C-alpha cells in the first residue's frame, strides 16, 4: 500500500506535476531527490503549507497515477 512510485517516474511525472500544480516550477522539479519528500519540500518552498496538507495533495497526485 506504501510505495514511492513518484521517484521512479520522476522525470516523466514532472510535467504532470507542473500541470497539477501550476505554481510549481518544472525546472525545480526536474532536479534531484524526486521522491515524495521532495514534493513536500517544493510545496513548502513554493506555497508553504503544513506537511500533512502537502502529503494529502501529493497522495492525490499519486491517486491520479
Curated annotation (Swiss-Prot):
| Gene3D superfamilies to which the protein is assigned, alphabetical | YjbJ
In the record, the note on similarity to other proteins reads:
Belongs to the UPF0337 (CsbD) family.
Q: Which PANTHER family match?
A: UPF0337 PROTEIN YJBJ (PTHR34977:SF1)
Q: What is this protein called?
A: UPF0337 protein PA4738
Amino acid at each position: 500500500m506504501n510505495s514511492d512510485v513518484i521517484k521512479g517516474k520522476w522525470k516523466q511525472l514532472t510535467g504532470k506535476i507542473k500541470e497539477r500544480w501550476g505554481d510549481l516550477t518544472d525546472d525545480d522539479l526536474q532536479a534531484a531527490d524526486g521522491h515524495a519528500e521532495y514534493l513536500v519540500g517544493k510545496l513548502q518552498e513554493r506555497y508553504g503549507w503544513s506537511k500533512e496538507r502537502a502529503e494529502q495533495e501529493v497522495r492525490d497526485f499519486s491517486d491520479r497515477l
